[PDB]
């Protein structure tokens, strides 16, 4: 019965990642004054199915890897960590209702850089390894502002419990007291997922260009699971919805609409901006977001004390 709950979590994750690709191609079509896919299915609804069947019977590139074992373990780790970030998500009830769900998510997203690192070293190209090291350095850079923005917000929560974050936002959204944290958080989640304007794995060859089309589709679907997940986590964190404990589907519809609009905001940002040069997003992290994030971390430490609004522990 619990395994039914695990499958009703993880199989709709795979379906929503399948159709996020279609939604991205359609929304980027209409924002680029064209259509998206509308031939393959009715309104293109069979485009992800056709494309998945195409990729799973495409020939393997059959490369020379330094490690066979890390070449197998990098997609396994990417998919496993992409699926374990969902299990504490309170929507309105988490699958695993853990007391440190925020810190668990922060740790399991910190572990996601080994997929990039192991897949880069598993490729024998030195250029793929250099691009992998640039992607890892970008990601661990933006993890700093993830951790500190998240800490500064949870100073208003009182605990690392994700389910308490619904109770925190019953009177107001937490984007009202923490909109600078919210906007730096949103750009930091944009830079965690190698998402445009921070997609330097498509700027002129990434880390996973040496895989077959099947494992490349697995990396791709882990990345889009991370995108949908970080939008849901941002929605829980700043745009927390109303919850009737006798009608949980009201909260589910509300956070689902907000998370869809936030994922479409990711799609709409990649359809609007040029890329950063690599040192420019290093400049954006280390010289712009991190001083503001430390200043607001001091502010959200000292502000519940000066207003007498320290939240409860329990």
């Amino acid at each position: 019965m619990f395994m039914i709950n695990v499958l009703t979590l993880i199989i709709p994750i795979l379906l929503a990642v399948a159709f996020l690709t279609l939604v991205e191609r359609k929304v980027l079509g209409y924002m680029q004054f064209r259509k998206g896919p509308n031939v393959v299915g009715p309104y293109g609804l069979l485009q992800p199915i056709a494309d998945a069947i195409k990729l799973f019977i495409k020939e393997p590139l059959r490369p020379a890897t330094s490690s066979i074992s890390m070449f197998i373990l990098a997609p396994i780790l990417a998919l496993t960590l992409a699926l374990t970030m969902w299990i504490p998500l309170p929507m309105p009830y988490p699958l695993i209702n853990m007391n440190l769900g925020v810190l668990f998510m922060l740790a399991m997203s910190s572990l996601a850089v080994y997929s990039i690192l192991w897949s880069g070293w598993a490729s024998n190209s030195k250029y793929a390894l250099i691009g992998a090291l640039r992607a890892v350095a970008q990601t661990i850079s933006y993890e700093v502002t993830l951790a500190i923005i998240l800490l500064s917000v949870l100073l208003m929560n009182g605990s690392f419990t994700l389910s308490t974050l619904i109770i925190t936002q019953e009177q107001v959204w937490l984007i009202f007291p923490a909109w600078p944290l919210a906007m730096m958080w949103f750009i930091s989640t944009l830079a965690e997922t190698n998402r445009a304007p921070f997609d330097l794995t498509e700027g002129e060859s990434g880390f996973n260009v040496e895989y077959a089309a099947g494992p490349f589709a697995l990396f791709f679907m882990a990345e889009y699971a991370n995108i949908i997940m970080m939008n849901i986590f941002t929605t829980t964190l700043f745009l927390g919805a109303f919850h009737n404990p006798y009608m949980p589907e009201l909260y589910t519809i509300n956070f689902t609409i907000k998370s869809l609009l936030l994922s479409i905001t990711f799609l709409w940002i990649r359809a609007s901006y040029p890329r950063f040069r690599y040192d420019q997003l290093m400049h954006l992290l280390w010289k712009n977001f991190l001083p503001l994030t430390l200043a607001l971390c001091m502010w959200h430490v000292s502000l519940p004390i000066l207003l007498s609004s320290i939240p409860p522990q329990t």
């Binding site: 712009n288 503001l292 200043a295 000292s302 004390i305 000066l306």
Partner: protein, 80 residues
């Protein structure tokens, strides 16, 4: 000192906002009338069992019942 402020606010407004927010976070808890209430609320929160006292015969400020008048009250927290 006023030309320096407009100059750095034109060149580097991220750092001006950073040092302004940091300076407010430093000085403002020592200027607020509510900083006393943070301490008062944290010591009013009963994580532990209030272990009773053996009544020797002379403790007029320790109650015999929770609904007795003597003892610490939290009407300041109910009102605020």
């Amino acid at each position: 000192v006023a030309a320096f402020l407009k100059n750095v606010w034109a060149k580097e407004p991220v750092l001006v906002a950073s040092f302004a927010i940091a300076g407010l976070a430093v000085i403002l808890p020592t200027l607020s009338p509510y900083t006393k209430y943070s301490l008062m609320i944290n010591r009013a929160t009963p994580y532990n069992y209030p272990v009773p006292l053996r009544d020797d015969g002379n403790m007029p400020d320790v109650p015999s019942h929770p609904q007795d008048p003597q003892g610490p009250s939290l009407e300041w927290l109910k009102r605020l």
